[PDB]
Design a protein around this ligand. Structure first.
Ligand SMILES: C[N+]1(CCCS(=O)(=O)[O-])CCCCC1
Ligand SMILES: C[N+]1(CCCS(=O)(=O)[O-])CCCCC1
Ligand SMILES: C[N+]1(CCCS(=O)(=O)[O-])CCCCC1
Ligand SMILES: C[N+]1(CCCS(=O)(=O)[O-])CCCCC1
Ligand code: NA
Length: 552
């Protein structure tokens, strides 16, 4: 264009005007906060001590640091503030949030409604924590296909609920329905991790209070800080655009660039403005008070074989009083392992041998294939509960195939064998890494890790309980686009107990990264871990033996 190159002073004159603008607005905000330097003390000038959780927070006593977290979020309410709970992973931000909701309901008579927006991969966990910790709090889970969400719209429109639990996707897609509601509180769980969503909330959603859950401290990313600032403190700049868009609106045409020191200049001011509204405690400073056992739901993918069989079964079933209970059972066999159907095993594994098909065909086995070595490599010992005995046979084949030493106990086990199996497992130097247990058939306090494979311990140790659930399956309903599951890094974050283990977990993830078959390093085949559609013949896509399978 008209760029006589010495005009670069024109971009710089615009950048200086834009930076100066950002500094004076944030200075005005801080000047105002201090007029009514310790900005925390002046922001939280109204105190209220919290000594005990609400009576309706049932099923667990808050830890001391969780009580102080509840007290801090209550200070946001009393002082008419928005805020950010940035506690490190493992401090129970989910539980603290439910403690805030119950406390506001019980003590302050704030019935709701409460808007809780969570990563799809943790939705099921959230739903479960609400059922355990706050059963009296009326809850709507807003997810699924459009015909499943229409059944909610009546209850939602009438306001006959207190908590609406949903994901970012439906906040955007179903805004015409959800933005009609006058929300009391909007809580956004950004996971540990942290586009369109911020604009949708800024323009259409009416809430009286806002809270962000994050797992990291305030970062050095301008885009993320900017998005946080404009959600927590929307009136300073009143813009739904990203930082880059906001910064470059003068030329709405080349991107104005900030020097390294200009970026740091902007980052520190945005940090300073947000600090009085941020609470973050570290695991190392509350280590003595950390809880006894914590439970996490882990969502698992379907393999292409499971997905194919599942769609076919469901279709055949809709064509058709406990014959409906049988259909539900068939879907549950699939979610556990396709090979529980003998016909599927014969077609897929005609050689009738133990190989990588054991874990490539079942999303739960493929997950266990990754995390069981991590536990083994960090000194832990695993109890595994099964509702279906038939899956225990397949698990035995897989464990033997991986060389993992286990014991097994079910209703077939004779009474004197049960005691001997327990005695062996409880031994100090037991070579047995795992205990396979039928839930129908105990003092297993040498194991600190518990995996509930499906559904219908520990000595002074952090006991961890994992509940495996197939995404988008009948298993989700029984427990009652966006990435349905979490990746290895996020998985390492919630399975590792300290920093020494997280390093061990990551070292194993890099060793797998260089596997000749499944690795993604250069010189590796890059074969997918879960079976893919191209690996399947034209089966289960009319055929009688496949309808008996669906309703058996
Ligand atoms: C925030 N506040 C008053 C708000 C009361 S309201 O009914 O509008 O929700 C002020 C300090 C006392 C505790 C609650
Ligand atoms: C956080 N905030 C906003 C008011 C709280 S509100 O939920 O209504 O948005 C901003 C400036 C003063 C301190 C309160
Ligand atoms: C750089 N900073 C924040 C420094 C951190 S402070 O200790 O002062 O709170 C932000 C922009 C204005 C000048 C102070
Ligand atoms: C190539 N391969 C071989 C797996 C090795 S196995 O021990 O299970 O035989 C089989 C096809 C899927 C990708 C892995
Ligand atoms: Na946001």
């Amino acid at each position: 264009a008209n760029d006589e190159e010495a005009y670069l002073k024109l971009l710089d004159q615009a950048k200086d005007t834009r930076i100066t603008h950002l500094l004076r607005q944030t200075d005005g905000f801080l000047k105002q906060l201090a007029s009514s330097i310790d900005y925390y003390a002046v922001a939280h000038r109204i105190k209220e001590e919290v000594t005990e959780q609400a009576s309706i927070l049932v099923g667990g006593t808050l830890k001391e640091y969780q009580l102080k977290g509840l007290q801090w979020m209550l200070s946001l309410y009393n002082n008419n503030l928005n805020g950010i709970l940035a506690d490190e992973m493992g401090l129970g931000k989910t539980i603290q949030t439910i403690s805030l909701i119950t406390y506001l309901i019980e003590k302050k008579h704030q019935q709701g409604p409460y808007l809780v927006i969570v990563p799809l991969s943790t939705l099921t966990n959230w739903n479960l924590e609400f059922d355990k910790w706050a059963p009296s709090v009326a809850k709507v889970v807003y997810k699924g296909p459009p015909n499943a969400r229409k059944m909610q719209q009546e209850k939602i429109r009438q306001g006959k609920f207190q908590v609406l639990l949903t994901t970012y996707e439906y906040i955007i897609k179903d805004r015409p329905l959800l933005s009609k509601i006058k929300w009391f509180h909007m809580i956004i769980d950004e996971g540990h991790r942290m586009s369109k969503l911020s604009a949708t909330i800024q323009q259409y959603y009416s809430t009286r209070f806002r809270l962000i859950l994050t797992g990291t401290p305030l970062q050095n990313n301008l885009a993320e800080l900017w998005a946080m600032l404009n959600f927590v403190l929307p009136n300073i700049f009143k813009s739904a655009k990203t930082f880059d868009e906001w910064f470059n609106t003068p030329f709405a045409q080349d991107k104005m660039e900030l020097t390294e020191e200009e970026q740091i200049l902007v980052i520190r001011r945005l940090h300073k403005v947000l600090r009085p509204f941020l609470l973050r405690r570290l695991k190392k400073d509350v280590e003595k008070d950390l809880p006894d056992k914590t439970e996490k739901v882990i969502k698992c993918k379907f393999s292409a074989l499971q997905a194919r069989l599942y769609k076919q079964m469901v279709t055949h079933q809709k064509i058709a009083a406990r014959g409906l209970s049988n259909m539900i059972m068939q879907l549950r066999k699939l979610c556990n392992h396709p090979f529980v159907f003998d016909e599927v095993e014969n077609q897929m594994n005609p050689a009738n041998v133990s190989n990588d098909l054991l874990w490539r065909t079942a999303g739960k086995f493929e997950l266990l294939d990754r995390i069981l070595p991590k536990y083994k490599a960090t000194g832990h010992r695993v109890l595994m509960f099964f509702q279906m005995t038939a899956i225990m046979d397949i698990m035995e084949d897989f464990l033997r195939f991986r060389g993992l030493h286990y014991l097994r106990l079910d209703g077939t086990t004779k009474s004197e064998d049960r005691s001997e199996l327990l005695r062996q497992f409880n031994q100090p130097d037991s070579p047995y890494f795992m205990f396979l247990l039928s839930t129908r058939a105990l003092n297993l306090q040498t194991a600190d890790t518990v995996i509930i494979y499906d559904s219908d311990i520990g000595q002074k140790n952090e006991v961890r309980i994992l509940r495996l659930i197939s995404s988008a399956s009948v298993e989700e309903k029984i427990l009652e686009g966006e990435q349905e599951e979490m990746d290895d890094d996020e998985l390492n974050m919630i399975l590792a107990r300290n920093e020494e283990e997280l390093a061990i977990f990551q070292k194993l993830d890099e060793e797998r990264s260089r596997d000749p078959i499944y690795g993604t390093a250069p010189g590796c085949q890059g074969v997918p871990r879960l079976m893919t559609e191209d690996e399947l013949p034209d089966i289960y896509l009319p055929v009688e033996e496949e309808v008996e399978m669906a309703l058996g």
